């Protein structure tokens, strides 16, 4: 009992514990096109702070803020993975469907990229099974449905006390998402980037978990 | 004519007429009879000290007695059916408002609430127009739940049979809980004036001896939250639902001493009247306490409710106001 408390509480004292600082740069995000938004016409009203400014009608995210945010997001993701809990990626976006499953399957994490049945998280035990565990963390690579409303899962995760980490875009509404990352959802370099990053954070959390378990076993 | 007769159930269907039921299966043993025979396997155990009792007949009087026994049995059952009227009244008589519904149901996860009281706020008969049936009658109950420890909530539920609906509202209401922050664990923190959809709620923060002066619904809700001292007057439309929604929004609208302290970065200091000038501290600004005094205006600009100011000068003369009423 004592040493398990030790194993879980130890990583919280170190801001870097999974050492993700090196996993990207502002240059990196810059070549992954993250800094591009939609036309100023399609902008949401709640992106006004996260934006940098309008270049000839096209809006541009603040990459400094992107890094500050994404850091915290990835850190969070990791600390959940290490603590051995469910992670569910979600996107409706078609171009990237395959990626996101192919990503998630390799993380030992789950994706839901599909039509999203309505009562899914809200009414779990009826939909999924007689009693069931629910995603510990939900992670959106797009915040939208193909009809350009907010994906149900946002309202629902938020409804269920699940934390949420997702990429807001200039048109999207950030406000219900626990940890946002402002950034471009549309360009494939960007999706790929975010994919592989959450992938890696997961992998490192899992490895580090295994390790500290082995050390736990030598100490005993 | 033995051929003409029927089964009991059929007779009760065609007696009752649903297009109260007494049972004749109760009280009669096997072999029980008016001609009073004791049959070796039924009326009597198969053997006595000596084996294999024969077929025997009781007396006249032994039978008069067993018959008296069955008669007194029927009397007992009738009394037991008539004694079945007992109740606890919620607000008034046949109003289900404030009636205890009993603790909600244990969820799927083994989660159990024996701590949660439920009260029915409003039971209402609601109708619809169905091409088939003509009118269609539903019952909808608005119900609240709380443990007294400050977390509580409410929900609506609706079903054809009212029993069903009581159930439904219970369970759905555990799903929406608010935490309601109480000062010194009875009052609210500061006054709340809140307009919500054609209904105005206003509530003053009382000291301790002053129990729960409120709209009967709001009393009920405040016993479920665990708020023991409150003044609350309601203006405009009184409809139950808007009222409880309003009240809950308002009591979650609350700004706590800690939060006041934090945003203003100053100490907050309670001046009791009973304790004189003694400047009790309630809250301190974790982080940096400001070195800056705050502006004292000879003239504060605040919304002032004419009702409070009318109260202040002795201008509320309504004979209903100062009434003695029963305990909280």
């Amino acid at each position: 009992n004592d040493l398990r408390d030790r194993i879980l509480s130890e990583p919280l004292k170190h801001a870097d514990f999974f050492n993700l600082k090196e996993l990207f740069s502002v240059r990196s995000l810059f070549d992954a096109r993250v800094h591009l938004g939609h036309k100023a016409g399609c902008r949401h009203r709640f992106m006004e702070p996260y934006l940098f400014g309008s270049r000839l009608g096209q809006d541009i995210i603040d990459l400094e803020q992107t890094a500050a945010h994404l850091q915290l997001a990835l850190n969070f993701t990791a600390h959940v993975a290490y603590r051995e809990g469910i992670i569910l990626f979600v996107s409706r976006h078609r171009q990237f469907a395959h990626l996101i499953e192919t990503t998630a399957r390799d993380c030992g994490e789950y994706a839901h990229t599909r039509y999203f049945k309505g009562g899914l998280l809200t009414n779990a035990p009826l939909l999924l099974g007689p009693g069931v565990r629910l995603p510990d963390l939900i992670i959106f690579l797009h915040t939208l449905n193909n009809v350009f409303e907010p994906h149900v899962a946002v309202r629902d995760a938020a409804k269920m006390n699940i934390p949420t980490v997702g990429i807001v875009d200039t048109n999207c509404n950030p406000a219900l998402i626990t940890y946002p990352v402002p950034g471009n959802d549309d360009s494939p370099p960007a999706v790929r980037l975010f994919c592989r990053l959450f992938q890696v954070a997961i992998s490192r959390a899992k490895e580090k978990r295994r390790q500290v378990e082995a050390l736990y076993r030598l100490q005993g | 004519s033995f051929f003409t007769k029927l089964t009991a159930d059929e007779l009760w269907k065609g007696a009752l007429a649903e297009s109260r039921r007494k049972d004749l299966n109760r009280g009669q043993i096997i072999g029980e009879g008016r001609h009073g025979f004791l049959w070796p396997g039924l009326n009597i155990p198969l053997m006595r000290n000596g084996a294999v009792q024969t077929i025997a007949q009781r007396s006249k009087e032994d039978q008069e007695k067993v018959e008296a026994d069955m008669v007194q049995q029927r009397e007992e059952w009738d009394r037991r059916r008539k004694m079945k009227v007992k109740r606890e009244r919620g607000w008034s008589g046949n109003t289900w408002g404030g009636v205890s519904l009993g603790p909600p149901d244990p969820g799927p996860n083994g989660e159990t609430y024996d701590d949660f009281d439920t009260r029915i706020l409003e039971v209402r008969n609601v109708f619809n127009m169905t091409a088939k049936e003509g009118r269609k009658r539903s019952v909808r109950v608005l119900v609240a739940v709380g443990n007294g420890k400050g977390a509580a909530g409410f929900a609506i539920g609706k079903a054809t049979e009212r029993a069903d609906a009581f159930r439904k509202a219970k369970n759905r209401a555990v799903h929406y809980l608010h935490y309601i922050e109480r000062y010194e664990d009875h009052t609210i923190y500061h006054d709340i004036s809140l307009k919500f959809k054609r209904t105005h709620i206003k509530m003053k923060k009382q000291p301790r001896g002053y129990g729960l002066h409120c709209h009967r619904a709001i009393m009920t809700i405040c016993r479920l939250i665990g708020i023991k001292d409150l003044y609350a007057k309601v203006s405009g439309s009184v409809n139950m639902l808007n009222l409880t929604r309003g009240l809950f929004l308002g009591l979650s609208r609350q700004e706590t001493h800690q939060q006041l302290a934090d945003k203003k970065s100053l100490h907050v200091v309670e001046f009791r009247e009973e304790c004189g000038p003694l400047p009790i501290v309630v809250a301190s600004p974790q982080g940096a306490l400001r070195k800056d005094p705050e502006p004292e205006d000879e003239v504060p600009d605040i919304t002032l409710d004419w009702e409070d100011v009318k109260a202040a000068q002795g201008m509320k003369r309504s004979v209903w106001s100062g009434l003695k009423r029963a305990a909280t």
Binding site: - | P207, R208, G209, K324, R325, A326, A327
Partner: protein, 51 residues
């Protein structure tokens, strides 16, 4: 009433444990009958008692 439905209860100046629950703890003033629900006779006897 509370007081007279139970005959074994005695209204006196002596039992403080009975008279206590008819006085407001914080305000130290007695309740008028309707707060409590006692009858007028027992309420007058209670005021005179607390005195």
């Amino acid at each position: 009433c509370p007081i007279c439905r139970d005959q074994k209860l005695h209204v006196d100046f002596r039992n403080v444990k009975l008279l206590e629950q008819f006085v407001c703890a914080h305000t130290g003033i007695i309740f008028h009958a309707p707060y409590t629900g006692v009858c007028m006779k027992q309420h007058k006897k209670l005021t005179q008692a607390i005195q």
